[PDB]
Amino acid sequence: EAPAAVVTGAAKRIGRAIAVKLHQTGYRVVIHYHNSAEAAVSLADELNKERSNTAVVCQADLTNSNVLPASCEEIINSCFRAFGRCDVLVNNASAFYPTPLVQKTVETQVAELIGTNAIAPFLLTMSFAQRQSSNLSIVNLCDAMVDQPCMAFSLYNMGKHALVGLTQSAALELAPYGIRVNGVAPGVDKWRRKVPLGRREASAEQIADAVIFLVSGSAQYITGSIIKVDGGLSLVHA
Amino acid sequence: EAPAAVVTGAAKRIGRAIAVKLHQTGYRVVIHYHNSAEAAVSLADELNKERSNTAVVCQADLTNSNVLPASCEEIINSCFRAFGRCDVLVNNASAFYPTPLVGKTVETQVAELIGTNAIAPFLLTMSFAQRQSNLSIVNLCDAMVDQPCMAFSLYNMGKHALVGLTQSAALELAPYGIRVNGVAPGVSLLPVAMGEEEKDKWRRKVPLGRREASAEQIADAVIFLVSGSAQYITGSIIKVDGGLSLVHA
Amino acid sequence: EAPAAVVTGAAKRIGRAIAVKLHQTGYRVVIHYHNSAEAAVSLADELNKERSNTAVVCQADLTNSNVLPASCEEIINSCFRAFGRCDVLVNNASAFYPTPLVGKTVETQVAELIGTNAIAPFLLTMSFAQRQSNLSIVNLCDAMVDQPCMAFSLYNMGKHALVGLTQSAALELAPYGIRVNGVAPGVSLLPVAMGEEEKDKWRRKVPLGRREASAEQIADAVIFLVSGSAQYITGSIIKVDGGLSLVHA
Amino acid sequence: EAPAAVVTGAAKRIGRAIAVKLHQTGYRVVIHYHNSAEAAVSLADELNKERSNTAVVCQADLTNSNVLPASCEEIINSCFRAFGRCDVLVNNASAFYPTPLVKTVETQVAELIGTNAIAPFLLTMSFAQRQSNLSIVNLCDAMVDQPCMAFSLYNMGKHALVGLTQSAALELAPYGIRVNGVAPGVSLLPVAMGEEEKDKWRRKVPLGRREASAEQIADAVIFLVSGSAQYITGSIIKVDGGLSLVHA
Ligand SMILES: NC(=O)c1ccc[n+]([C@@H]2O[C@H](COP(=O)([O-])OP(=O)(O)OC[C@H]3O[C@@H](n4cnc5c(N)ncnc54)[C@H](OP(=O)(O)O)[C@@H]3O)[C@@H](O)[C@H]2O)c1
Ligand SMILES: NC(=O)c1ccc[n+]([C@@H]2O[C@H](COP(=O)([O-])OP(=O)(O)OC[C@H]3O[C@@H](n4cnc5c(N)ncnc54)[C@H](OP(=O)(O)O)[C@@H]3O)[C@@H](O)[C@H]2O)c1
Ligand SMILES: NC(=O)c1ccc[n+]([C@@H]2O[C@H](COP(=O)([O-])OP(=O)(O)OC[C@H]3O[C@@H](n4cnc5c(N)ncnc54)[C@H](OP(=O)(O)O)[C@@H]3O)[C@@H](O)[C@H]2O)c1
Ligand SMILES: O=c1c(O)c(-c2ccccc2O)oc2cc(O)cc(O)c12
Ligand SMILES: O=c1c(O)c(-c2ccccc2O)oc2cc(O)cc(O)c12
Ligand SMILES: O=c1c(O)c(-c2ccccc2O)oc2cc(O)cc(O)c12
């Protein structure tokens, strides 16, 4: 049978491009969404028109709460139910906004910027591992600018740092199960002009290309690695 | 007057050593504690006998919850209430225990490991900054964050997040003259419940002396970062690890 | 026409697997070698049997000296002479041996370890850029550069310098459309001289499979970085280490 | 009785401030210089006025060559001949200039890689072979991962010095020799540089919109060689005002 992948936040932008490329490579896909139901179904419709019953949607709020563990279990379960297997988890969903240190409640901001960006990936990783010839792997969507962060983005940056720690800890702990764990770290008119490879427009498809590599048989010895896909931006001094 | 410092988890071990060395340097100190009330009061008693009215205690749970922002605000408020100023914040308190991927509910583990290690330092940083000389924050990091112990993912995530806070807060608070740095132990004071044979296994890994860091050695790096000799240093994390992090598998 | 690639130290082991995979992908190849003439010519013959006029050899010593720039210029020139273009440079050649701090002279060890691992890649990069589609350079780095082998200081210095070159050249060559990236093996093909018991010692450290990387697995990451699927990737170093660099002492 | 230190490139700027602070802390000092003889001698004379027979100068070119190992051995030897001991080595001397990809190139290699990396390696070898609170401090660069355009050889040399710091920390730890680094961002700016250009760099620094003084860099060196750092080895302390944290 065809392998199957879960992509979180898959309705639009980067998650959509990732789901499309996995599907094109022969994966069946779970398109996770929170609010973007119309877009998720529209994508599933397009993929199913290409190959019948190869795409399903799954609703879950990835905010941290007492029910986040159940929601993450359901995302993984939905893959097994539709397809009988779950070979690939892509932790792509993320919240992004500033949280200034000097002036949503702050604990709501914690729930979104830490919950969605780090805790949901952790819980999804647990559920994925617990439910397990094969080529099993997880890819976490990191941030190339994690060590040169945007001003007043402390909670966002903390969450993306935690995600690096998860990538490394899970790579170590899941290696005995043959589960590889890796990351892809994107960068980004003012910003475009900073990018060394700025002649090329940045695209969601370029991010997806790195995800496709990492889940492929061409990356079977790669675990705990984070691939920057940033056009050189992180190399540029102030 | 004398400057004042908040040290979290200061009743015992590394936090106590930091509080003691800050006090010896001339600081008035808030000794934060959670469960170790007898030890915290005993320490404050010793310090106050040395110089009267220079130490207070402050109890707070630093587990994440909807009241954590108020608890962190209160810790900073206690320093201003006792001493009329708050010059230094040391984020030392930490929960440390395994959370295998394959007692406590997972959401409790998240609240404790991510709350103590990262969210509380964030909220304390917010409160410290908002309440405002040589002002600085020192975060107790971990030199082994990139070579983590097996089955400690939540602990490791929290310490990674603490590196992110150190860097983000250094950037953002620099215009206010608040420096933000870290001290990253490798192996220092081993868990009390750890057997000696297991302690020795870890000691033997350390290139510089085949021994763990003393609490004083960790405190020495904190003292440097808060001192005038570190006035241009912000966003730096000083490993105090005897070379441990350089040793391959 | 078909694009062309220079692979240094391509007669044997990882460089050979890289040359083969680039050839299989459609590249014409310059097989650079130093001492392994029989192996280099044998490889070129095998590749030419597959597609005529798609492989040549080029001999050069990559030890540092006042003639190293001419040797590196010649390697790039050989690709233009054979194929009329040079699209890819893979800096794979390496000297590897201990140089303790406490029968070669020290300046020979410097010339060999720093020359082959760092200076030659720099000069080859200069020549490649000056002679100039999907142009790129791939440097063979080392996943263990921050947890080095005992008594390998010069080797480790050379590999650190190669990280610096990768980043500096990525920055400087980006406006010419030349990407510069690295592939960092952990334990891959072990030294020929090594005993089986010692080889197994190292194999057992690797989390993913308890085995070293095959040459083919290292080559796979090089193939990705030179491909159209990596056109926004520059200044990146991909570890291909089975998790080895994540394992504490 | 009093410990002794070698400081390379100690005649001016950062190395001068390091030599002064070490001397103030109680060290006897070898002031290494290459071209700056008058400044080296003036510093030695000032230090000897403070305490007799506590400073000497030592001339050497630290460019890579067949004679570099002997030169580096002689620098370390000069400390033992003057003071009977050598407790601290500070690798401060540096060549710094652009080397665009697109002086001969091999001269540039010899200068940039020799001063910044090979000379520190050879001095480390000689220091260790000759051997309490022993340590080495290497002057690194906080911007090694966000380098200036067209500075590849300089950047390669400073990356190699990070590798040396870590490899030597590991290998010399059994001998009780600690090996650490101090990594400035922008400190003392080139003397010729216009104030208007200096200001473009100063404005980038989060902490105070100014460059580090030489004394602030020296303060981190003094901490690292002190009894307060006796468990610290293989560590590189940035002294950069937050500069390395600032995105493009
Ligand atoms: N020890 C090492 O080898 C080592 C290695 C790497 C990093 N570090 C870091 O260095 C710092 C000091 O280490 P340590 O071994 O001295 O720390 P520790 O003894 O493990 O913990 C210090 C204090 O943290 C407080 N704490 C724990 N959970 C809390 C909660 N939910 N709310 C409020 N306070 C809480 C406790 O206070 P009460 O006792 O009052 O309840 C405890 O005494 C920590 O940040 C640690 O992560 C230590
Ligand atoms: N193997 C591993 O486990 C491992 C681990 C980390 C990094 N790496 C890196 O990956 C790359 C390939 O590894 P490998 O084990 O296949 O390499 P290797 O066999 O050690 O060396 C590859 C080739 O480099 C050439 N070479 C050595 N000294 C030279 C000189 N002075 N001038 C010109 N060429 C010279 C040799 O060519 P001739 O035979 O023609 O003389 C040799 O065949 C290297 O850069 C290595 O540092 C490998
Ligand atoms: N200044 C900064 O902003 C900055 C930033 C990042 C890193 N750093 C690092 O911090 C350290 C001190 O910086 P600095 O600006 O004070 O250094 P500097 O003035 O550029 O150089 C220090 C000394 O190095 C010596 N030197 C240069 N080439 C030499 C050679 N071939 N042989 C022997 N000695 C040689 C020179 O000695 P003579 O004058 O006697 O010839 C010079 O006075 C350096 O390692 C530098 O790379 C500085
Ligand atoms: O990080 C710790 C740690 O690695 C270790 C550690 C424990 C056993 C063996 C090696 C260790 O580094 O102990 C800790 C104890 C604490 O109270 C708090 C901590 O953060 C640590
Ligand atoms: O870096 C290498 C290495 O660590 C090792 C290595 C050797 C023994 C045990 C573990 C290792 O990673 O082998 C190499 C062999 C080479 O020909 C070239 C190299 O760069 C290495
Ligand atoms: O690294 C340096 C540097 O970045 C700079 C620098 C120069 C201009 C603008 C910004 C800088 O960081 O100056 C140096 C001067 C030296 O004498 C030696 C150095 O290593 C530097």
| Domain range summary for chain A, segments of one domain joined by + | 1-238
Q: What is the CA radius of gyration of chain C?
A: 17
What is the DSSP track for B92-146?
A: --------------HHHHHHHHHIIIIIHHHHHHHHHHHT----EEEEE--TTTT
What is the DSSP track for chain B?
A: ---EEEETT-SSHHHHHHHHHHHHTT-EEEEEESS-HHHHHHHHHHHHHHSTT-EEEEE---S-STTHHHHHHHHHHHHHHHHS---EEEE--------------HHHHHHHHHIIIIIHHHHHHHHHHHT----EEEEE--TTTTSPPTT-HHHHHHHHHHHHHHHHHHHHHGGGT-EEEEEEESS-SPPTTS-HHHHHHHHTT-TTTSSPPPHHHHHHHHHHHHSGGGTT--S-EEEESTTGGG---
CA B221 – CA B225 distance, rounded (Å): 6
State the DSSP H helix or E strand holding residue C171, giving kind and residue range, or none if neither: helix C153-173
CA D96 – CA D108 distance, rounded (Å): 10
From residue A77, give the alpha-carbon distance in Å to each of A34, A81, A84: 17, 6, 9
Structure tokens at C190: 């072990």
**C241 C-alpha to ligand 2 centroid (Å):** 17
What is the DSSP track for D175-189?
A: GTEEEEEEEESS-SP
Smallest CA–CA distance, residue D66 to chain C, in Å, is 6
Output the CA torsion sign for B82, B86, B87, B90.
positive
The residue of chain D with its CA nearest to that of B213 is: D231
The residue of chain C with its CA nearest to that of B203 is: C249
**Catalytic residue at B97?**
no
Residues of A with CB under 8 A from a CB of C: 168, 171-172, 175-176, 178, 180, 196-200, 202-203, 206, 209-210, 212-213, 218-225, 227-232, 234-236
Q: What is the resolution of this structure in A?
A: 1.4
Structure tokens at C98: 């201990």
CB contact under 8 A, D100 and C161: no
Is the separation of the CB atoms in A186 and A17 below 8 Å? no
State the DSSP H helix or E strand holding residue D158, giving kind and residue range, or none if neither: helix D152-172
CB contact under 8 A, A145 and D204: no
Under 8 Å CB pairs connecting chains A and D tally to 32
Binding residues of B, as ranges, are 12-14, 34-36, 61-63, 92, 94, 136, 155, 159, 186, 188-189
Q: Please determine, looking at this structure, whether the domain spanning C1-249 carries the CATH number 3.40.50.300.
A: no
**C149 C-alpha to ligand 5 centroid (Å):** 9
**Domain A1-238 belongs to what architecture?**
3-Layer(aba) Sandwich (3.40)
Nearest to C87 by CA among C142, C34, C128: C128
Give nearest CA residue, ligand 4 atom 7.
B190
Q: What DSSP designation does C10 have?
A: -
Helix, strand, coil content of chain A in percent (nearest 5) = 45, 15, 35
Smallest CA–CA distance, residue C79 to chain D, in Å, is 19
CB contact under 8 A, A235 and D147: yes
**Which atom of ligand 6 is the closest one to the Cα of D198?**
9
The residue of chain B with its CA nearest to that of C203 is: B249
* For the CA of B185, the nearest ligand: 1
What is the DSSP track for C28-92?
A: EEEEEESS-HHHHHHHHHHHHHHSTT-EEEEE---S-STTHHHHHHHHHHHHHHHHS---EEEE-
CB contact under 8 A, B221 and D229: yes
The C-alpha angle with vertex A227 and arms to A221 and A231, in degrees rounded to 5, equals: 145
CB contact under 8 A, A119 and B119: no
Residue for token digits 């040793």?
B247
Give nearest CA residue, ligand 5 atom 15.
C191
CB contact under 8 A, A173 and B153: yes
Helix, strand, coil content of chain C in percent (nearest 5) = 50, 15, 35
Smallest CA–CA distance, residue B25 to chain D, in Å, is 14
Angle between helices B153-173 and B106-114 (to 10 degrees): 40
End-to-end CA distance of chain D: 50
A125 contact partners, CB below 8 Å, separation of at least 6: A89, A91, A138, A166, A170, A174, A181, B101
Which chain D residues are within 8 Å of A192, Cβ to Cβ? none
Catalytic pick among B97, B155, B200, B232: B155
Binding residues of A for NADP(+), as ranges, are 12-14, 34-36, 61-63, 92, 94, 156, 160, 187
**B11 C-alpha to ligand 1 centroid (Å):** 10
State whether the beta carbon of B241 lies less than 6 angstroms from ligand 1.
no
**Catalytic residue at C155?**
yes
Nearest to C232 by CA among B102, B35, A155, A232: A232
Binding residues of A for NADPH, as ranges, are 13-14, 34-36, 61-63, 92, 94, 156, 160
The residue of chain B with its CA nearest to that of C244 is: B249
Under 8 Å CB pairs connecting chains A and C tally to 105
End-to-end CA distance of chain A: 51
**B92 C-alpha to ligand 1 centroid (Å):** 6
3-state secondary structure of D19: helix
**A43 C-alpha to ligand 1 centroid (Å):** 48
Give nearest CA residue, ligand 6 atom 12.
D186
For domain D1-248, which CATH number applies: 3.20.20.100, 3.40.50.720, 2.40.10.10, 2.60.40.10? 3.40.50.720
State whether the beta carbon of B199 lies less than 6 angstroms from ligand 1.
no
Phi-psi map region of B233: left, alpha, beta (phi>0 left; psi -120 to 50 alpha): beta
Nearest to B62 by CA among B4, B18, B116, B11: B116
CA C83 – CA C29 distance, rounded (Å): 9
**A223 C-alpha to ligand 5 centroid (Å):** 19
Give the largest CA-CA distance in chain D. 54
